[PDB]
Amino acid sequence: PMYQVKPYHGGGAPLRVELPTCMYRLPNVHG
Amino acid sequence: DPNQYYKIRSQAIHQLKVNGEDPYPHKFHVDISLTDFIQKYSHLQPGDHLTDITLKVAGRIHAKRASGGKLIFYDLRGEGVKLQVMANSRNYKSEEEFIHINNKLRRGDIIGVQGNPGKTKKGELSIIPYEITLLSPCLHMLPHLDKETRYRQRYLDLILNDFVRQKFIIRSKIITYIRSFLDELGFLEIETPMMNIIPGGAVAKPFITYHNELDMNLYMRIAPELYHKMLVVGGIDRVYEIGRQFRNEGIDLTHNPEFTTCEFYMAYADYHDLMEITEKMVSGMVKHITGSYKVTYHPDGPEGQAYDVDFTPPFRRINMVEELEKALGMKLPETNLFETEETRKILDDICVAKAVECPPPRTTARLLDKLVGEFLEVTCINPTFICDHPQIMSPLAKWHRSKEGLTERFELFVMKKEICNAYTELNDPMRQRQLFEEQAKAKAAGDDEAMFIDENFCTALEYGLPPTAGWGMGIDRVAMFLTDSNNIKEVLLFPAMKP
Amino acid sequence: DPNQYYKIRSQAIHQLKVNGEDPYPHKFHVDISLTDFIQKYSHLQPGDHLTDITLKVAGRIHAKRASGGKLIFYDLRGEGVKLQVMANSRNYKSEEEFIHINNKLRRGDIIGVQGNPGKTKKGELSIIPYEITLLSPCLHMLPHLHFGLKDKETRYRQRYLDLILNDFVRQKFIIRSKIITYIRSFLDELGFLEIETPMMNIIPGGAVAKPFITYHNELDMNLYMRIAPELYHKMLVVGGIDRVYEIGRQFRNEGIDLTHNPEFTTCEFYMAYADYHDLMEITEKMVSGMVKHITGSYKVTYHPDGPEGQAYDVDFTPPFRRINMVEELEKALGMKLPETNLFETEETRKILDDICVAKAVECPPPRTTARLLDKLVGEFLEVTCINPTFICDHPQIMSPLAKWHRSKEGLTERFELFVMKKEICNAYTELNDPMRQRQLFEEQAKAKAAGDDEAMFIDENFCTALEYGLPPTAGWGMGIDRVAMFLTDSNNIKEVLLFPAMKPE
Amino acid sequence: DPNQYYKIRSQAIHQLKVNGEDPYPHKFHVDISLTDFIQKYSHLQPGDHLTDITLKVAGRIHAKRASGGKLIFYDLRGEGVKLQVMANSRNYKSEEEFIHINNKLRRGDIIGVQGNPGKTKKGELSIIPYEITLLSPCLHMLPHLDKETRYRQRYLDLILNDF
Numbered sequence A: 001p002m003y004q005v006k007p008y009h010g011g012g013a014p015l016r017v018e019l020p021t022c023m024y025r026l027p028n029v030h031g
Numbered sequence B: 001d002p003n004q005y006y007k008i009r010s011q012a013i014h015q016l017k018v019n020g021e022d023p024y025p026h027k028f029h030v031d032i033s034l035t036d037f038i039q040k041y042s043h044l045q046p047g048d049h050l051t052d053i054t055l056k057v058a059g060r061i062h063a064k065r066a067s068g069g070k071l072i073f074y075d076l077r078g079e080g081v082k083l084q085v086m087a088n089s090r091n092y093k094s095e096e097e098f099i100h101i102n103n104k105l106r107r108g109d110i111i112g113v114q115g116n117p118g119k120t121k122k123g124e125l126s127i128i129p130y131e132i133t134l135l136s137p138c139l140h141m142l143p144h145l146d147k148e149t150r151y152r153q154r155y156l157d158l159i160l161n162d163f164v165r166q167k168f169i170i171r172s173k174i175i176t177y178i179r180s181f182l183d184e185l186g187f188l189e190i191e192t193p194m195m196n197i198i199p200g201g202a203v204a205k206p207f208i209t210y211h212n213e214l215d216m217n218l219y220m221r222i223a224p225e226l227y228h229k230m231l232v233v234g235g236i237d238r239v240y241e242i243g244r245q246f247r248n249e250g251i252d253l254t255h256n257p258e259f260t261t262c263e264f265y266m267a268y269a270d271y272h273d274l275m276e277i278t279e280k281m282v283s284g285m286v287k288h289i290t291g292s293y294k295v296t297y298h299p300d301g302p303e304g305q306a307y308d309v310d311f312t313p314p315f316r317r318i319n320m321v322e323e324l325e326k327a328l329g330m331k332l333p334e335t336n337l338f339e340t341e342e343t344r345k346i347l348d349d350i351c352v353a354k355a356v357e358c359p360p361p362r363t364t365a366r367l368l369d370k371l372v373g374e375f376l377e378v379t380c381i382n383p384t385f386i387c388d389h390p391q392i393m394s395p396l397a398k399w400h401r402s403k404e405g406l407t408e409r410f411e412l413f414v415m416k417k418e419i420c421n422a423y424t425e426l427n428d429p430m431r432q433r434q435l436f437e438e439q440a441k442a443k444a445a446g447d448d449e450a451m452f453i454d455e456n457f458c459t460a461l462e463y464g465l466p467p468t469a470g471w472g473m474g475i476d477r478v479a480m481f482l483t484d485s486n487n488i489k490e491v492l493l494f495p496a497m498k499p
Numbered sequence C: 001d002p003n004q005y006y007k008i009r010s011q012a013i014h015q016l017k018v019n020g021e022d023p024y025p026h027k028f029h030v031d032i033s034l035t036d037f038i039q040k041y042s043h044l045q046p047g048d049h050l051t052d053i054t055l056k057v058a059g060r061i062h063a064k065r066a067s068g069g070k071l072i073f074y075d076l077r078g079e080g081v082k083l084q085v086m087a088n089s090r091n092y093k094s095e096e097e098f099i100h101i102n103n104k105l106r107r108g109d110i111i112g113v114q115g116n117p118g119k120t121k122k123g124e125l126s127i128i129p130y131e132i133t134l135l136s137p138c139l140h141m142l143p144h145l146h147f148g149l150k151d152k153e154t155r156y157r158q159r160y161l162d163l164i165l166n167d168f169v170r171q172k173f174i175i176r177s178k179i180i181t182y183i184r185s186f187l188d189e190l191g192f193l194e195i196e197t198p199m200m201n202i203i204p205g206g207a208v209a210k211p212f213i214t215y216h217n218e219l220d221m222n223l224y225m226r227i228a229p230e231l232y233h234k235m236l237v238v239g240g241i242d243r244v245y246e247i248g249r250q251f252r253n254e255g256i257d258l259t260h261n262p263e264f265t266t267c268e269f270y271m272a273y274a275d276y277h278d279l280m281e282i283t284e285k286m287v288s289g290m291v292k293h294i295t296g297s298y299k300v301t302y303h304p305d306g307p308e309g310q311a312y313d314v315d316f317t318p319p320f321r322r323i324n325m326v327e328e329l330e331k332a333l334g335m336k337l338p339e340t341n342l343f344e345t346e347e348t349r350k351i352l353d354d355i356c357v358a359k360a361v362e363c364p365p366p367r368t369t370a371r372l373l374d375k376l377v378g379e380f381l382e383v384t385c386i387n388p389t390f391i392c393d394h395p396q397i398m399s400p401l402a403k404w405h406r407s408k409e410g411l412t413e414r415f416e417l418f419v420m421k422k423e424i425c426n427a428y429t430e431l432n433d434p435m436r437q438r439q440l441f442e443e444q445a446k447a448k449a450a451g452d453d454e455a456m457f458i459d460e461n462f463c464t465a466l467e468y469g470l471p472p473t474a475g476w477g478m479g480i481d482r483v484a485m486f487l488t489d490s491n492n493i494k495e496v497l498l499f500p501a502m503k504p505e
Numbered sequence D: 001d002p003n004q005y006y007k008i009r010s011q012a013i014h015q016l017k018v019n020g021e022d023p024y025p026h027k028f029h030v031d032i033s034l035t036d037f038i039q040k041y042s043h044l045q046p047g048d049h050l051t052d053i054t055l056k057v058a059g060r061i062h063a064k065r066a067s068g069g070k071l072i073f074y075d076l077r078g079e080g081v082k083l084q085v086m087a088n089s090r091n092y093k094s095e096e097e098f099i100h101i102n103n104k105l106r107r108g109d110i111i112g113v114q115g116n117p118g119k120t121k122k123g124e125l126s127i128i129p130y131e132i133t134l135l136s137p138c139l140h141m142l143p144h145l146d147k148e149t150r151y152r153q154r155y156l157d158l159i160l161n162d163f
């Protein structure tokens, strides 16, 4: 096996991108 | 009749425009995908109707079926799945509007649906609309259920044929898997020029183009090889590139003029290392994507027999010259004699005797290549390494450390077709320059297959390229084998076609 | 002298080949990277020597320093870091081999080193070799930071020299790679399919540009290198693939300057059932997220005029400022503009021409309505876009593939994202009415046949695809190289291209 | 003792402020209500763990229970319902962070949870966190399970009494 080289992304943790988001909703109490 | 349909529908849609009914609305607010809808409500019992839940979905109409005067079913498709729309006037916003929309809609139309989850008596999952909106009408008569048409109108192919999408999803998974594999090994993903003053790194007829601002002709790249090695000289020890190459050659089942490859270069590695890495990458790829090491392939298409191709490592290895000797039933010259005219003549004679055709020029490299094609490559069904090519056919490969006249090179073959090419990189600038001079001399004599000499690259080598091994893979061909396609056009979204 | 150096070293290396000393060995077994070596043994105390640990490393000699007859220091570099080799005669395999190898090696050579971790009295982490092996000699006089190379042209013509000598260059291309990887991750997670579409076309489309022309042997016809993948992407959306993206090369046969190269990399994506409002939100999220991930914060320092000019912090903190093109331009001009639509009207064109003249805003022929507006927008609006800024609602006459604005007559649902006066993104709600699209193509066609050589060709095939029904959709493009420029503090596109195109030397 | 608790927690929270750990963050992106979460995943079988699904929820901690050194249960309440948070270091973003957050959190705190739907062996619906965020700490000792107090501090009445 070839000698180890750490990934350029750092090696800490898998890339975790910030994604778009949507304010959650609660149901109509009267419905 | 299709022509009539188009004339009639076009007029009806223009009329919708004139009447201010907006047949191409700007925005429809899809709430949930069809896939998620199916997943969320498949647990429903026949007859159920969640009147409290209203959702918005969208897709393309593949079927329209009336049942009485107040009920119409639409087959709504998207994302490779389907959902029934069960429209009864009783649940619709209004009866008049129910009438108007149903009269407006046709097979092929893109629609948005607002309604409730439900299930028919027969147990068919459905959405029961409060309102249906036309999002984009189909002006043509949608086809139902040759290959030319599939390739010239890929969008039609994609609409009608579920498997096509799946092939391109698999293609994408292959590429993404490779990036993950190399990134994890500490490779840097790079981009090198697609336009070159001098094309190199392969044997191919190039595309030529005129660049205006530089007032000079340029060639489209046939490979990125020489740039990558210069980057390794630059001290970037591990590099890779997945990108397009261009070869101005013929089109057939396994060749397209533009195609996608992955090349990577690894300092302090040799060809033995690249064999293990190739095995691990390819076997791991097949297993991750298909669920096992064995994949079914129809080399002659579905009309013929199928074979399970076994990617379980380790792969079979054969040595070009030795195996060719066995295959021919005759002793070949010593490998240190492969540069001689005597050997060329011997190969020419063998080709004649065995009825192996080789068009001019009948050079040693080409005659050997034809022989290898005939007697060795055809035996490579499962993944097979063909190794230790003569130097005369491998002008960028490093001489073999123990076999005089050979090189430390391998090719990986699957189902008689080449998917990878790799070698310990030649890093002796004097020997590389000698080989380039021989190429250029052959080129001037009339051998079109000969390489151009690249001075900038040779100069780069003079600064010191570490011992290094490099590797290339034909992505399209890999995709062919993992999608059971025997025509490269199946794994290219828009293949080149004669108009 | 360098010329003499090369002759002498070449002969010496040749003599090594003759004597069977193998100066280009096939395989050396590296045990550990220099980065790992440093991380593992930085803890050592001055004077430490781990005699029980033997490791193999490799790299390029950047310096050679003799200290008496029995001690030599080599500055060994790789991976952007350095490690000192402290070669002591008594620790070497033998004194005779110690002399022989030292007499053989020169600055620049690639070597492999087998030895023990250690640290000098002065506290310098080192490896103490049992054996050193020449892996690949440098035949030229290797340049040095003090002298060289800062000369741009040499740097771009011999990028390998630039990478060897200048650590910041490697760092720029690492950042560039991180940008692309970030975008793929972002789009993959939103369910987009990464696709590849033809780079060679019968008709180039999807942008305004001069194409490259080439000859295809098999089909015996000329083909054009793509200027944009846009029309293929929309046909696939028609095909039912709702979300697609492609990061790839485009070719435009135009000028070369600080922000323009004839081949450059873009990302385009197309998203069914989205409009331009959705794409602004996604753009803000992607770009701000990218900047914070890569740099550690939303604020980036940039030198728009290079290191000899003033720097500015660019704030990518969302939400981005939004301005409407015509509105803001009218405010900046202190006057109202004439209304325009799809058709070129001489009255309107003349009014814009007069405005350009009065404001001393240049516009080379042809002085079309769209081009005069473009120049005006450049002078008065783009120059104010320092922080990321959306310029929105372009006139239809500037946007032949953009859908008409649902509430603003004569305008379109389009935006461009500007950073430091340069446009890093272009996007719009896609025109999906075939009759309207064909109509715009006919106007483009007229204008070509009238003298606009950048104007679009009718794509009869694409219009046909639109006739089968393109869902409401929004598309987007990003100039990857420009983003890289802004995130690497480069004001020249050549800094973020490994091998930029250069006029012959 | 309630007075002592308040003095001690107040100091700890001010310290979080000084250390730049932002104990009152501006925005947490709730993905789904607790009610919908319960409705969506009650069909799960004991032992299940949907590692492909990540969701964000929020609420008030009504109970904290350690089980060994690598497992802590939080009773998360809101909307008149409750959801168990099953935090094991093995599923958390990192062990060190797992330690830090658990040491920080107390009964009463408002928290945001990012994690996967799951079910314990015993059949308790749960969310298994990748990350927990303190949204608003409770500085006072939360009461458990006169009428004057209920009427003068209606918010306490509402927290404690579902009816």
Ligand SMILES: C[C@H]1CCC[C@H](C[C@H]2Cc3cc(O)cc(O)c3C(=O)O2)O1
Pocket (backbone or CB within 6 Å): B204, B247, B248, B249, B250, B254, B255, B256, B257, B258, B259, B261, B418, B419, B420, B421, B472, B473, B474, B475, B476, B477
């Ligand atoms: C980089 C190389 C390594 C060997 C396999 C493969 C060869 C490549 C040859 C080749 C030549 C050509 O003119 C057109 C094509 O579509 C291909 C191909 O797909 O496969 O990729």
Ligand SMILES: C[C@H]1CCC[C@H](C[C@H]2Cc3cc(O)cc(O)c3C(=O)O2)O1
Pocket (backbone or CB within 6 Å): C252, C253, C254, C255, C259, C260, C261, C262, C263, C264, C266, C423, C424, C425, C426, C477, C478, C479, C480, C481, C482, C493
């Ligand atoms: C696809 C587009 C969208 C807008 C930003 C960017 C524009 C693009 C224009 C452009 C034109 C050209 O001829 C040469 C170039 O290097 C560029 C560039 O880098 O930026 O990418």
Ligand SMILES: N[C@@H](CCCC[NH3+])C(=O)O
Pocket (backbone or CB within 6 Å): B201, B202, B222, B223, B224, B225, B263, B421, B422, B423, B470, B471, B472, B473
């Ligand atoms: N450039 C080669 C692939 C890499 C070979 C090893 N450097 C080809 O096009 O076949």
Ligand SMILES: N[C@@H](CCCC[NH3+])C(=O)O
Pocket (backbone or CB within 6 Å): C206, C207, C227, C228, C229, C230, C268, C426, C427, C428, C430, C474, C475, C476, C477, C478
């Ligand atoms: N093709 C555009 C980018 C995408 C615009 C939105 N469809 C360009 O080259 O500028």
